[PDB]
UniProtKB/Swiss-Prot annotation, chain A:
Transmembrane segments: none annotated. Component of the mitochondrial large ribosomal subunit (mt-LSU). Mature mammalian 55S mitochondrial ribosomes consist of a small (28S) and a large (39S) subunit. The 28S small subunit contains a 12S ribosomal RNA (12S mt-rRNA) and 30 different proteins. The 39S large subunit contains a 16S rRNA (16S mt-rRNA), a copy of mitochondrial valine transfer RNA (mt-tRNA(Val)), which plays an integral structural role, and 52 different proteins. bL32m has a zinc binding site. One of its GO terms (cellular component) is mitochondrial matrix. This is Large ribosomal subunit protein bL32m. It comes from the Eukaryota. It is found in: Mitochondrion. The chain holds residues 79 to 186 of 188 of the full protein. Zn(2+) binds at C32, C35, C45, C48. It comes from Homo sapiens (Human).
From Swiss-Prot, chain C:
GO terms for molecular function: protein domain specific binding; structural constituent of ribosome. Keywords: Mitochondrion, Ribonucleoprotein, Ribosomal protein, Transit peptide. It comes from the Eukaryota. GO terms for biological process: mitochondrial translation. It is found in: Mitochondrion. This is Large ribosomal subunit protein bL17m. Detected in adrenal gland, mammary gland and adipose tissue. Component of the mitochondrial large ribosomal subunit (mt-LSU). Mature mammalian 55S mitochondrial ribosomes consist of a small (28S) and a large (39S) subunit. The 28S small subunit contains a 12S ribosomal RNA (12S mt-rRNA) and 30 different proteins. The 39S large subunit contains a 16S rRNA (16S mt-rRNA), a copy of mitochondrial valine transfer RNA (mt-tRNA(Val)), which plays an integral structural role, and 52 different proteins. Its main location: mitochondrion. Belongs to the bacterial ribosomal protein bL17 family. GO terms for cellular component: mitochondrial inner membrane; mitochondrial large ribosomal subunit; mitochondrion.
From Swiss-Prot, chain D:
This is Large ribosomal subunit protein mL45. GO terms for molecular function: RNA binding; structural constituent of ribosome. It comes from Homo sapiens. The keyword Transcription does not apply. Component of the mitochondrial large ribosomal subunit (mt-LSU). Within the mitochondrial ribosomes, required to direct the nascent polypeptide toward the tunnel exit and position the exit at a distance from the membrane surface. Belongs to the mitochondrion-specific ribosomal protein mL45 family. Its main location: mitochondrion. Component of the mitochondrial large ribosomal subunit (mt-LSU). Mature mammalian 55S mitochondrial ribosomes consist of a small (28S) and a large (39S) subunit. The 28S small subunit contains a 12S ribosomal RNA (12S mt-rRNA) and 30 different proteins. The 39S large subunit contains a 16S rRNA (16S mt-rRNA), a copy of mitochondrial valine transfer RNA (mt-tRNA(Val)), which plays an integral structural role, and 52 different proteins. Keywords: Mitochondrion, Ribonucleoprotein, Ribosomal protein, Transit peptide. GO terms for biological process: mitochondrial translation. It is found in: Mitochondrion. It comes from the Eukaryota. GO terms for cellular component: mitochondrial inner membrane; mitochondrial large ribosomal subunit; mitochondrion.
Swiss-Prot record, chain E:
The modification N6-acetyllysine is found at K91. Residues 28-94 form the TGS domain. The gene is MRPL39. Changing G264V: In COXPD59; uncertain significance. This is Large ribosomal subunit protein mL39. GO terms for cellular component: mitochondrial inner membrane; mitochondrial large ribosomal subunit; mitochondrial ribosome; mitochondrion.
Length: 108, 166, 152, 171, 290
């Protein structure tokens, strides 16, 4: 079917600008106590998560170097190590991954 | 094309006498030719329309719409220049005075329908405008009380005249 | 009408549904932590937990081997399942996987969840932490607890 | 090497000329007359004079001088460029001035209204010796390393620390 | 007469504040470094005896001002609205901090102050109200308390539940006004000029003057009411969201002079309890605390 008459600006302005079609204010925002950036509650801090994922990205890169080719996932557990630290007695008998930097504060 | 909004930052007022209220600082800023619909931009403009800078940046951060990051940029640019050039003491004590989107210049392409028929498609562009006023944001007008309704009704009855006499 | 419909329809049909979930599960096994759409993470999550229980049955179980064969596409992960993952979760009876909601995807604006198997080698996810016991409200509640215990 | 070019230069009477030229330059800044300033101040100097002053009001005044102005050194160039001989003469001036700078909204942002404070300044003057239409103009200021800091500003500031990318730690 | 007394004390407070303001030569730029976990190495170039931790906060963001309750200046608790003295390291303290020990202490100290404020102006002039002090009480204890001497006429008088609800709404009114807690640190003498009428405040001032090597004492003003405090307070009254004056208890060895310990419990806006939980907290504050 086809419109029988042009809708006026006022009619349209009532459609468009009612509270239903408006953007609602979010009330669940907070400050990330860790980094001090803004995070939504119920959601992980975007900054903090990026930080983790950049670290874990590099760890996965070192995993590839040592593994060296597809279909070579080991049958032991894994541990990650940084500059100036040694595997414990219980750490013995599992895969070691080395690093060229200091251990992060948040990663313990 | 007109570019009035830019020039608004070049207005110089003469120095105030010590016996005067401290004039709020005043920053006008915009972005032109945003590839986004002007009416779509309106909703985001309308949202931040009366809030403080930080509170607007907060609201804009978690907003999913495309233009939301664009407005965030404009606001941060405006805040930066406010402190640097417009002699604003604190960056936090700014609120959005007016937030407006205009139609920018548009192009026309063709859309190919069935049979031989076609239509004229428009690559939509728009501008965004903002104004920042130094100081705490204005407290919203309180909702009208029963006593206020009553008060004004009394006023209204008292305004009656005997009509079409001397 | 669809009350108490448990599984959510996913791919281009039930066969595809399984296939997507199997891919997700394969990834998670291998890498131990995976970002994917919130619905799909939630959906796959259950099959991930059920896989550890089959893994707990052991290499010797022929049924469990056939299951692992289907659900792991890499075939090199099957030893890992049975000699790494199953031994790791010996104590716990359940609750091997954790899922969290992270910021929405940039391109798509989709809800995104990270899922990881617990006790992995990787750097730990920023996790929601309840406020310290030394907070004003917690101290007042600890006060009330003191009253009740010391009354008898 | 000045005299051979002009032959009507006196070292005795120049300091007064240097003084009044200084004052009228600052009066130019006050009323925002750039044309007179150009006749009066070199092309090196003018950007340093006027880059900040635009979109704000200056209220500069000259109070009586303490120590009379005197020349400290005179030096001349030796044909570094074709048809160009320049002459730099340096004057020490010790005087009290008043200054106020207002904001774009006219809010007093620096200095005081009408109370003088003493200043010691070293000023350099250039002339085109070759050019017949060349004129003595203020060229620059010399700041001593031992000079006391400029009087403090009205507002408070924040200096931002390093803005760290997620993959960085503060030192 | 009390109505003139209150305004007299204000005039005296104001003139001392003006005196302390005037001895500052124009403005000296002090440097303050942010030593917080968040946004590190920020340096604020502040006015010497003018700028506050609040001013530093409001350089950063509204999130600081909204959720900043105390300051550490060289690792000492410092009022939000207290003007600084010298260059230092500054960090801000919130309620949801790991160790909010100092923050909790400051909160209760402030609530007790405003309870005393509302009690004073709750009775008619024919009766005598005498505020003595607010003793230091652990937050893990039932509630905050202020000790009061009333008239000999009201020796038999015990407050009813309706009277308690009356105080409740009265203190609530104060919160609604949203009054900043102005602070002033002075020598003992000028403070004695402020409080010479009540001896119960005279000796307390003398106590603080004696214990400190200097004769410095802290006076906290909430709009009009001046009171002697033992440490730093909360910035504004708005911080409180729940506030009920729970009970009044008579102390036992009070044959020479009766002491009435007013008790009430409060929670700040950031840490608000559900209806049921708050109710059980009121129950505990009804018990006499020592
Ligand atoms: Mg065709
Ligand atoms: Mg069209
Ligand atoms: Mg679909
Ligand atoms: Zn964070």
């Amino acid at each position: 079917a086809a419109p029988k008459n042009r809708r006026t600006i006022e009619v349209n302005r009532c459609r468009r600008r009612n509270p239903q079609k408006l953007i609602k204010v979010k009330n669940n925002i907070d400050v990330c106590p860790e980094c001090g950036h803004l995070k939504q509650k119920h959601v992980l801090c975007a900054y903090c998560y990026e930080k983790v994922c950049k670290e874990t990205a590099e760890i996965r890169r070192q995993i590839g170097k040592q593994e060296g080719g597809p279909f070579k996932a080991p049958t032991i557990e894994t541990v990650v190590l940084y500059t100036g630290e040694t595997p414990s007695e219980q750490d013995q008998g599992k895969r070691i991954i080395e690093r060229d930097r200091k251990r992060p504060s948040w990663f313990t | 094309i007109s570019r009035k909004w830019e020039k608004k930052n070049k207005i110089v007022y003469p120095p105030q006498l010590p016996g005067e209220p401290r004039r709020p600082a005043e920053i006008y800023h915009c972005r032109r030719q945003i590839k986004y619909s002007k009416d779509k931009m309106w909703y985001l403009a309308k949202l931040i329309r009366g809030m403080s800078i930080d509170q607007a940046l907060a609201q804009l951060e978690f907003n999913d719409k495309k233009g939301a990051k664009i407005i965030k940029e404009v606001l941060l640019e405006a805040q930066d220049m406010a402190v640097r050039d417009h002699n604003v003491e604190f960056r936090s004590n700014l609120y959005i005075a007016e937030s407006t989107s205009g139609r920018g210049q548009c192009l026309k392409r063709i859309r190919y329908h069935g049979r031989g028929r076609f239509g004229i498609m428009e690559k939509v562009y728009c501008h965004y405008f903002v104004k920042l006023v130094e100081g705490p944001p204005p407290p919203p007008e309180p909702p009208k009380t029963a006593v206020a309704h009553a008060k004004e009704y009394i006023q209204q009855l008292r305004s009656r005249t005997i009509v079409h006499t001397l | 009408i669809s009350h108490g419909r448990v599984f959510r329809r996913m791919g281009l049909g039930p066969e595809s549904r399984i296939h997507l979930l199997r891919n997700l599960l394969t990834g998670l096994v291998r890498h131990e932590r995976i970002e994917a759409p919130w619905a799909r993470v939630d959906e796959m999550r259950g099959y991930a937990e059920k896989l550890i229980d089959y893994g707990k049955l052991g290499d010797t179980n022929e049924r469990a081997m056939r299951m692992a064969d289907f659900w792991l596409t890499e075939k090199d992960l099957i030893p890992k399942l049975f000699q790494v993952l199953a031994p790791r979760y010996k104590d716990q009876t359940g609750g091997y996987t954790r899922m969290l909601q992270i910021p929405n995807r940039s391109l798509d604006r989709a809800k995104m969840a990270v899922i990881e198997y617990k006790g992995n080698c990787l750097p730990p996810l920023p996790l929601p932490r309840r406020d310290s016991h030394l907070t004003l409200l917690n101290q007042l509640l600890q006060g009330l607890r003191q009253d009740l215990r010391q009354s008898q | 090497r000045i005299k051979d070019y002009d032959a009507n230069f006196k070292i005795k009477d120049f300091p007064e000329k240097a003084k009044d030229i200084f004052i009228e330059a600052h009066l130019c800044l006050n009323n925002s007359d750039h044309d007179r300033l150009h006749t009066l101040v070199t092309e090196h100097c003018f950007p340093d004079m006027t880059w900040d002053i635009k979109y704000k009001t200056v209220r500069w005044s000259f109070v009586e001088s303490l120590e009379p102005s005197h020349v400290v050194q005179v030096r001349c160039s030796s044909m570094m460029n074709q048809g160009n001989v320049y002459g730099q003469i340096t004057v020490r001036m010790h005087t009290r001035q008043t200054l106020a700078i207002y904001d774009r909204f006219g809010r007093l942002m620096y200095g005081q209204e009408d109370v003088p404070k003493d200043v010691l300044e070293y000023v350099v003057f250039e002339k085109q010796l070759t050019n017949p239409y060349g004129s003595w103009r203020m060229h620059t200021k010399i700041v001593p390393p031992w000079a006391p800091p400029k009087q403090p500003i009205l507002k408070t500031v924040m200096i931002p620390g390093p803005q760290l990318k997620p993959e960085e730690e503060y030192e | 007469s009390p109505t003139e007394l209150t305004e007299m004390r204000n005039d005296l407070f104001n003139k001392e504040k003006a005196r302390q303001l005037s001895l500052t030569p124009r403005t000296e730029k002090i440097e303050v470094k942010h030593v917080g976990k968040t946004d590190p190495g920020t340096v604020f170039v502040m006015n010497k005896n003018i700028s506050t931790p609040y001013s530093c906060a409001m350089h950063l963001s509204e999130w600081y001002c909204r959720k900043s309750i105390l300051a550490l200046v060289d690792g000492q608790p410092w009022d939000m609205y207290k003007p600084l003295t010298k260059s230092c390291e500054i960090k801000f303290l919130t309620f949801k901090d790991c160790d909010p020990g100092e923050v909790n202490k400051a909160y209760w100290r402030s609530c007790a102050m405003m309870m005393g404020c509302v009690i004073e102006r709750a009775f008619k002039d024919e009766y005598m109200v005498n505020l003595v002090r607010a003793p230091e009480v652990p937050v893990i204890s039932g509630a905050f308390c202020y000790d009061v001497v009333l008239d000999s006429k009201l020796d038999e008088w015990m407050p009813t539940k309706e009277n308690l609800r009356s105080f409740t709404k009265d203190a609530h009114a104060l919160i609604y006004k949203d009054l900043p807690f102005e602070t002033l640190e002075v020598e003992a003498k000028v403070a004695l000029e402020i409080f010479q009428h009540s001896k119960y405040k005279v000796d307390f001032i003398e106590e603080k003057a004696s214990q400190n090597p200097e004769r410095i004492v802290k006076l906290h003003r909430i709009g009009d009411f001046i009171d002697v405090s033992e440490g730093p307070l909360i910035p504004r009254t708005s911080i409180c969201f729940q506030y009920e004056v729970s009970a009044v208890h008579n102390l036992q060895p009070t044959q020479p002079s009766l002491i009435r310990r007013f008790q009430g419990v409060s929670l700040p806006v950031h840490l608000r309890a559900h209806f049921t939980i708050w109710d059980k907290l009121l129950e505990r504050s009804r018990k006499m605390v020592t």
